[PDB]
Amino acid sequence: MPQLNTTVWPTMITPMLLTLFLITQLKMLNTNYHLPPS
Amino acid sequence: QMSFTFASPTQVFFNGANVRQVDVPTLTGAFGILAAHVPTLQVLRPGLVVVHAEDGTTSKYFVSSGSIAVNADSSVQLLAEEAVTLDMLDLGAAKANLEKAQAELVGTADEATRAEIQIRIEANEALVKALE
Amino acid sequence: PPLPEYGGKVRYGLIPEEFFQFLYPKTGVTGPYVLGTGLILYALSKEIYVISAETFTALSVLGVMVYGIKKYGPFVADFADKLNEQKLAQLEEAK
């Protein structure tokens, strides 16, 4: 199982955090829902 | 084979009519009754009532409360306290009364009064859901 | 700035009409198509595109994608348009 090859493990951990915790959240924050007018 | 009798204290929607299916919102869930259905007796909760005539057309009413009785001779008696055709209701009043009842629920503190508030709440929720 | 009303005129969802109109002067109409056919044949002949299980998984996912597009494309398209028109009507009503 290549999933147990613990050598390339950082290569999977590092960008995910850069993608799950910074980039995707920065794209969500730009998804704004305004309040309906009168 | 099924003889339906859908009535209200002042209006008779059906009387011994021969329909094929009738959907009812029993207090113990919804169910649809056809001919030869197992005999049962139940009390209703606010909800739709759909009657399928043999010609494949469906008439939709809204019942507030009452009783349903499917009998051994395939005779169904549906007696609603307040039965109204759908086009006689509006959505805005339903939503407004739902909001008022939710506010009074969050405001109230006594048990029985809270139960009455909740009953009116579910009434209005079924109203909104059945309308649109 | 207002948005243009149409995109880029892609053929088969893969190649834009720019390529065909750019290759039309020298090699006519069947020019680009015969170029693509020769490319595909040279690829799957010189073992550039090896045939394996991934080939049939690719064909299956491409079939499912094309069917999903051809089936629920009008629905999603007019649904997005209808969302936009509902929002526009509400806004103009609040004006």
Binding site: - | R45, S64, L89, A123 | -
Partner: protein, 45 residues
């Protein structure tokens, strides 16, 4: 056993509340006549 039965209500009261809430959600074209045909006037002695 519904919640209002635990509270001490009765299906007469449940039905009254439900019919009232359904009468209130009527459009005003029918609301007056429907409240007339279903109002109570008896008084306990």
């Amino acid at each position: 056993v519904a919640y209002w039965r635990q509270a001490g209500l009765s299906y007469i009261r449940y039905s009254q509340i439900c019919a009232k809430a359904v009468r209130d959600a009527l459009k005003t074209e029918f609301k007056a006549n429907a409240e007339k045909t279903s109002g109570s006037n008896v008084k306990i002695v």
